[PDB]
Amino acid sequence: NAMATVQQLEGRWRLVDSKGFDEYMKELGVGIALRKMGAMAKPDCIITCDGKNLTIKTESTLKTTQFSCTLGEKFEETTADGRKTQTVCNFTDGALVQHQEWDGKESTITRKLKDGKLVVECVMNNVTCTRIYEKVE
Ligand SMILES: CCCCC/C=C\C/C=C\CCCCCCCC(=O)O
């Protein structure tokens, strides 16, 4: 994915498209009552990366979560759905890669810039979710 800077990902983004998010949440083990609220939301995403210090805010009018970390160093993340995972974030090959592990399970969220839009790609097992954000200018 070329030689992009992580700075190109920085800033405030807004969801404009989502496909397969409900299927992905299912694979995580999220309850219907929760999946309904999750898929219904039009969240913002605020990404800030100072050198290797990464912070991602996931914000909706009802619920807001965030994580902060150092690229390359594992940390305990509390996800929005309530999972406690061992997560490492890396900016590899021009893409922000968030790898999660918990209870013997695995999931990877990959964020890249493409055609000016933030392309978020969530993967667990055979399930792939693709969510598109655009810059809030
Ligand atoms: C009342 C609203 C409550 C909504 C929150 C509840 C459920 C959240 C659902 C599961 C979170 C899955 C984490 C993956 C997020 C990546 C999506 C993205 O980065 O684009």
Describe this entry's structure for a reader.
The chain has 137 residues and is mainly beta. It is 12% helix and 57% strand. The protein binds linoleic acid. The site of linoleic acid has 18 residues, from helix 2 and strand 9. This is Fatty acid-binding protein 5. Monomer. Homodimer. Pfam families: Lipocalin. It catalyses: hexadecanoate(out) = hexadecanoate(in); (9Z,12Z)-octadecadienoate(out) = (9Z,12Z)-octadecadienoate(in); (9Z)-octadecenoate(out) = (9Z)-octadecenoate(in).
Defining traits:
monomer, 137 residues, mainly beta, Lipocalin, ten-stranded antiparallel β-sheet, 10 strands, 12% helix, binds linoleic acid, long-chain fatty acid transmembrane transporter activity, phosphoprotein, Fatty acid-binding protein 5, synapse, identical protein binding
Task: List the SSEs and their pairings.
Elements: E1 11-19, H1 21-28, H2 32-40, E2 44-50, E3 53-59, E4 64-70, E5 75-78, E6 84-92, E7 95-102, E8 105-114, E9 117-124, E10 127-135
Antiparallel strand pairs: 1-2, 1-10, 2-3, 3-4, 5-6, 6-7, 7-8, 8-9, 9-10
Helix pairs in contact: 1-2
This protein binds linoleic acid.
Linoleic acid binds at residues 25, 30, 34, 37-38, 41, 45, 58, 60, 62-63, 79-81, 109, 120, 122, 131.
SSE string: EHHEEEEEEEEE
Bound molecules: linoleic acid
CATH fold group = Lipocalin
CATH superfamily placement: Calycin beta-barrel core domain
What is the domain total for the residues? Answer: 1
Q: Estimate what percentage of residues fall within beta strands.
A: over 45%
Classified by CATH, the class is: Mainly Beta
User: If helices are DSSP runs of H or I spanning 4 or more residues, what is the number of helices?
Assistant: 2
Shape: globular
Helix content: 10-25%
Rounded to an integer in angstroms, the radius of gyration calculated over CA atoms is 14 Å
Structural category: mainly beta
InterPro entries: Calycin (IPR012674), Fatty_acid-bd (IPR000463), ILBP (IPR031259), Lipocln_cytosolic_FA-bd_dom (IPR000566)
Protein name: Fatty acid-binding protein 5
Subunit structure: Monomer. Homodimer.
Family: Belongs to the calycin superfamily. Fatty-acid binding protein (FABP) family.
